[PDB]
A = this chain, B = another copy of it.
Amino acid sequence: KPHRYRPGTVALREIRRYQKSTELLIRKLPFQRLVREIAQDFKTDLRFQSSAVMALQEACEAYLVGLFEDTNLCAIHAKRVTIMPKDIQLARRIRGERA
């Protein structure tokens, strides 16, 4: 009976959808709960402005979107279309995030 797109076509459509949009891609509550756990190891009983956490999220996603561009390039360099941990690790060594 059913319909089935070939593997990779829903993927490209998702690539097009999300590159033409600007909404935040990590859902709000899990991110805010992440942010407060990490903050707590540095300083306790901390309050946050909504905008502070909103900015923290804007930066993380922008950083991660960028890292996936660079990882992608590394993947393709080794004749793959799949990003693997070794690709992320190479992009950060070249960005000096590893030094």
**Contact mask for chain A residues 78-99; partner B; CB cutoff 8 A; 1 contact, 0 none:** 1100000010001101111000
- Total residues of chain A contacting the partner, CB 8 A: 13
Interface check A70, CB cutoff 8 A: yes
User: Contacts of A70 on B, CB cut-off 8 Å?
Assistant: 93-94
How many copies of this chain does one complex carry?
Answer: 2
Asked whether A77 lies within 8 Å of B90 as measured between CB atoms, the reply is yes
Q: Which residue of B lies closest to A92 (CB)?
A: B94
Interface residues of A in 8-37 (CB under 8 A from B): none
User: Contacts of A95 on B, CB cut-off 8 Å?
Assistant: 94-96
Residue of B74, B93, B96 near A90 (CB, 8 A) is B74
Interface check A53, CB cutoff 8 A: no
- A73-B94, A95-B96 given; 6 more Cβ-contact pairs under 8 Å: A74-B74, A74-B94, A78-B78, A91-B94, A94-B94, A95-B95
CB of A39, distance to nearest CB on chain B (Å): 30
Complex Cα distance, B88 from A42, in Å, reads: 40
